[PDB]
Design a protein around this ligand. Sequence first.
Ligand code: HEM
Length: 153
Amino acid sequence: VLSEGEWQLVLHVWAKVEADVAGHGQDILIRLFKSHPETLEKFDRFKHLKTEAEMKASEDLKKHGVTVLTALGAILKKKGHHEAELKPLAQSHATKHKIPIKYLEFISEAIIHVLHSRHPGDFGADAQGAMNKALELFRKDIAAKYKELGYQG
Ligand code: HEM
């Protein structure tokens, strides 16, 4: 359970993201795909991209980055009271997209890295710890829905 102080730290940096959702989403997906190439293989939509320059030039990848970060922002802004938002996301990622929980750890690391790069003055250690806790809460709650459905592994 995050404290109100931890949520404020999370949402203070998140408000900076919402100034350039698309640039953040590109940086985060690209870092994900470079750091963990097995993730790229889950996107039939993107698996033709073989270089970081190709990734940066894909408007379709930039669109998906906005989709991802818009869904994550709506979850974060519920401060934990996010059951309605997670249900559908867990269900599609477990049963349709077939995304292991570990890959949600990987994209959480990429989000934290990108926020540190773009917002260092609002992403000191206190805020990095709080965002780590927020993303852990996201993964914990998704993992409980995966387990229900027979996908926690
Ligand atoms: C912060 C974590 C994430 C969020 C908030 C998120 C959100 C979304 C949303 C909102 C959609 C479209 C609606 C739906 O299908 O449910 C989507 C699609 C999808 N996501 Fe995620 N996602 C996350 C992480 C991941 C990761 C780590 C992967 C793969 C490694 C992945 C793979 C996919 C795939 C394959 C699609 C369908 C893309 C397509 O072909 O259109 N997601 N995601």
